[PDB]
Amino acid sequence: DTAQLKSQIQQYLVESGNYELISNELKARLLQEGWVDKVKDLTKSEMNINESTNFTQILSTVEPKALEMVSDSTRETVLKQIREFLEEIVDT
Amino acid sequence: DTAQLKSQIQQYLVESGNYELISNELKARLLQEGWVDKVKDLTKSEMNINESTNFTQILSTVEPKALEMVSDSTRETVLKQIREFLEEIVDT
Amino acid sequence: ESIVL
Amino acid sequence: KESIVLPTVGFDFIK
Amino acid sequence: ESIVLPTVGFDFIK
Amino acid sequence: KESIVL
Amino acid sequence: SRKDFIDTMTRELYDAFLHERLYLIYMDSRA
Amino acid sequence: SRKDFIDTMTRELYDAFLHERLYLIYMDSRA
């Protein structure tokens, strides 16, 4: 049921509208830090050096560097909001 | 590379516009057959038997029945279109 | 453990 | 604005 | 104008 | 070995 | 064979399309 | 126990959100 619990989380996350809000906020925030443009320019330039450019391939070279570049403000705000949602949904 | 090839397929499947086309066709067709309404009423009653209404939970009881209700026309038309696309993308 | 809405 | 926002295939929470 | 992305439901991989 | 051509 | 490769890839994609279609009916049904 | 559950569930959801965000940049970038 471990994989079935994740379905219930994702289920309620989307239906309650929290998925929309968080994905929207996270876009707006990452966009203002210039984190979008920084990650965008890296993927674009990563695409030009290598002829065959597969997503899972460039994911491994861009993802780890991109996580840390997330401003601490943004990362903590989102993590908080996620946990607050989880805290209400998970049972005692 | 098996999981990495599926990434390339899906990549080109979406970028080439075939994902859009096929999902729309598949919607329009299944909608006219009344396959939607049949699966619609089926999920609803499947949700009513069990208090906890999870997608993955009902999926095991609804998915197999829904495939077979797909008109022979539709199933073959889509399978054909999918294969035709694959045949061009995969190399010899 | 459990998920109650 | 009328229907619910579903995550894209990119949202890989499950698997 | 933009490209149509599949939803989370389109589970080609896994 | 299986290849993907655009 | 290459024939068997596309055979599985076909079914998996067909399933994905229908799996998604079900999900959308599930989510739309809870409305 | 429950505390450890939410901790991982949080990180996994956070990662999904960002993973998706990358994907949208990848796809939008190839345009």
Numbering used by the authors:
A (entry chain B), B (entry chain E): 4 to 95
C (entry chain X): 327 to 331
D (entry chain C): 326 to 340
E (entry chain F): 327 to 340
F (entry chain Y): 326 to 331
G (entry chain D), H (entry chain A): 756 to 786
What do the authors of the reporting publication say about this deposited model?
In budding yeast, the TREX2 complex binds to NPCs and is thought to function in integrating the nuclear export of mature transcripts with earlier steps in the gene expression pathway, together with promoting genome stability through inhibiting R-loop formation (1–4). TREX2 is constructed from a Sac3 scaffold to which Thp1, Sem1, Cdc31 and two Sus1 chains bind. Sus1 and Cdc31 bind to the Sac3 centrin binding (CID) region (Sac3CID, residues 723–805) that has an unusually long α-helix about which the other three chains coil. We report here the crystal structure of the interface between TREX2 and Nup1 that shows that Nup1 residues 330–340 bind primarily to a cavity formed between the Sac3 helix (residues 757–777) and the Sus1 chain closest to Cdc31 (Sus1B) and show that Phe336Nup1 and Phe338Nup1 are crucial for this interaction.
